Amino acid sequence: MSEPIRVLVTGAAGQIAYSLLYSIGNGSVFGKDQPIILVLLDITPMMGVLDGVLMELQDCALPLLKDVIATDKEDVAFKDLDVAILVGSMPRREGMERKDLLKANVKIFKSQGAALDKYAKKSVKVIVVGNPANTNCLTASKSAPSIPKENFSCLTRLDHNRAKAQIALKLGVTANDVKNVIIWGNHSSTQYPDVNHAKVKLQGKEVGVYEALKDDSWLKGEFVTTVQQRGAAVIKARKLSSAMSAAKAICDHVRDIWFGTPEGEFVSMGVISDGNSYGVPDDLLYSFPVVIKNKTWKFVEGLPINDFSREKMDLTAKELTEEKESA
Amino acid sequence: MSEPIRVLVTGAAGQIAYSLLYSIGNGSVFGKDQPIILVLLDITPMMGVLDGVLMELQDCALPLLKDVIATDKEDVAFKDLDVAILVGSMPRREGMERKDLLKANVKIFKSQGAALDKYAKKSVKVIVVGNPANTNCLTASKSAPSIPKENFSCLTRLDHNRAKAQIALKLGVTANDVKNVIIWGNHSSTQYPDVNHAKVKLKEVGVYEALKDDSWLKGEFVTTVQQRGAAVIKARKLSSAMSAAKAICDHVRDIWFGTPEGEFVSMGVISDGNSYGVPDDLLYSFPVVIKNKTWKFVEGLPINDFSREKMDLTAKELTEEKESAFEF
């Protein structure tokens, strides 16, 4: 390629980044002909771990990895970025309530937004992973007034992929046989996994998921509940939070930005809500169904919203409005 | 699509496997048109973590992953296998005498060899990763008399890839531009990282001639590669799973699809009939070319005096290991 792109991953000594870096370095995200300068940020006490991660990346003998830089300083980390994957955040520990998790992280993302605004390229694409994702993204965006608001997205693709898998498992097909599920709203308990516009190929024929299942109460109750609580279920089994599947979801999310959404499909992404036609307040970071071409996302327009869907999309909008006011 | 192949990964609840399963599931090891039935084996205490691993594999929404089976039973794990990746072994607890460790691992791999011998396809490819890789692989091979000995291999590709990375680093070139490094012999400690037959494009020139620093290549390069895994563990304090999993993928891919034209790779294989003065009936890393899923020795490579000593010393380590373990 003409030039390597500089891709920053924060929280780079942690578990999600450990499952993500190889896929970036080996060409599976940005393309088999795209060299990459990988920039890794984490806190100062983690710099020794991060030198070990540099050693492993070296020992993968990846031809596209032109350089890997480890740092604990924002000026180094955010310099001339083409992509910023914001994984680092403060975790919710025992004893702290949801308000405290929000308070802890607002300062982190206001600072990374300021660094983006001062050091990165104005064309940088910023994908926000660390929780609370949507509000962390909004905070950073507001602190980066020189970077176009459309360049900020937050990760609902993990919830999206989980919704797909539950449908595929119930109906007995592969993941690629399901498409156009939607995660509306907050990456949180109030997310709405919507399948009113989803399709599945069943006997060579594409059918709606509602029609295919003949079980509306499952789709409107237990299905929603399973996708919302999936993260806690994984934590309960392996005593750690998801890392492999979260990294795979980041790869999907960034790849669809870089290359575009597949023909006939749209995907779930947290984006700035300004101008949406679905009754969602403006100036929220909210997950919508989008299509992507030339690295520019676009709302999927004209989807019919029934009354069950209306109630769910409004409840998640309310929670996001309340998180914003806390910040 | 091809019919599904059944692929086992043992130690499936551990760190290396956690970094490996995605690459198998997403098609990058066995091909984008090859559906996979992924069989995961670990010890009963790990079954709870293993079910969370299974949940994450579902949550990747992988079209090629036809099914995922998680189990602690050999008769389930080894049925009708096309590939078995034996990652799990007994790790050495602090203050464990090596007699007890050799007995624990002989027991594991005798059992798994017997399960291969009774339940798997006779065409199964077996790749041994868990330490001590070479002797564990030999144990399983001898415990599986009906499986062709050539179907067994053990992982030296991690040290092979590390060697390639150090050469490219020292010559200021990209990883794609070095080929034909060799790891001879044992998987750890005494492994001989040999670049006497390696090429680098600057166009194509021998590495010794390109670098013009015989003592670094015979000294610091060798100890850097031999000690690289201990250096990563010191820094990360945890596994070296990301690069070990990449190496496993490279190793299995090169079995499945073959080595590129003009290139060989490093693989622990049964030493029978080699022409390099290595004892027979050893599992020993050699340079190999692979076609139609069948490896063959790269023959006739000139062995200088320095290389002969390095290859004999690692042969001696393996011989002593084999005698010690087979007392069990």
UniProtKB/Swiss-Prot annotation, chain A:
Write out the entry's keywords from A to Z: Acetylation, Cytoplasm, Disease variant, Epilepsy, Methylation, NAD, Oxidoreductase, Phosphoprotein, Tricarboxylic acid cycle, Ubl conjugation
List the catalysed reactions: (S)-malate + NAD(+) = oxaloacetate + NADH + H(+); (2R)-2-hydroxy-3-(4-hydroxyphenyl)propanoate + NAD(+) = 3-(4-hydroxyphenyl)pyruvate + NADH + H(+); (S)-2-hydroxyglutarate + NAD(+) = 2-oxoglutarate + NADH + H(+)
GO CC entries: centrosome; cytoplasm; cytosol; extracellular exosome; extracellular space
Ligand binding (NAD(+))? G11, A12, A13, G14, Q15, I16, A17, D42, N105, Q112, V129, G130, N131
> Which molecular function terms from Gene Ontology are attached?
diiodophenylpyruvate reductase activity; hydroxyphenylpyruvate reductase activity; L-malate dehydrogenase (NAD+) activity; malic enzyme activity
Range of residues in the leader sequence: none
Output the superkingdom of the source species: Eukaryota
What is the main EC category here?
Answer: oxidoreductase
EC number annotated for this UniProt entry: 1.1.1.37, 1.1.1.96
Where does the protein end up? Answer: Cytoplasm, Cytosol
Post-translational modifications: ISGylated. Acetylation at Lys-118 dramatically enhances enzymatic activity and promotes adipogenic differentiation.
The answer to whether the entry has keyword NAD is yes
List modified residues, type N-acetylserine: S2
List modified residues, type Phosphoserine: S217, S241, S309
Catalytic site residues? Answer: H187 (proton acceptor)
Q: Which Gene3D superfamilies match?
A: Lactate dehydrogenase/glycoside hydrolase, family 4, C-terminal, NAD(P)-binding Rossmann-like Domain
HAMAP family referenced in this protein's UniProt entry, alphabetically: Malate_dehydrog_2
Q: Which disease is it linked to?
A: Developmental and epileptic encephalopathy 88: A form of epileptic encephalopathy, a heterogeneous group of early-onset epilepsies characterized by refractory seizures, neurodevelopmental impairment, and poor prognosis. Development is normal prior to seizure onset, after which cognitive and motor delays become apparent. DEE88 is an autosomal recessive severe form characterized by global developmental delay, epilepsy, and progressive microcephaly.
Which protein family is it in?
Belongs to the LDH/MDH superfamily. MDH type 2 family.
Tell me, in a sentence or two, what this protein's role is: Catalyzes the reduction of aromatic alpha-keto acids in the presence of NADH. Plays essential roles in the malate-aspartate shuttle and the tricarboxylic acid cycle, important in mitochondrial NADH supply for oxidative phosphorylation. Catalyzes the reduction of 2-oxoglutarate to 2-hydroxyglutarate, leading to elevated reactive oxygen species (ROS).
Name of the featured protein:
Malate dehydrogenase, cytoplasmic
What organism is listed for this UniProt entry?
Homo sapiens (Human)
Chain's gene name = MDH1
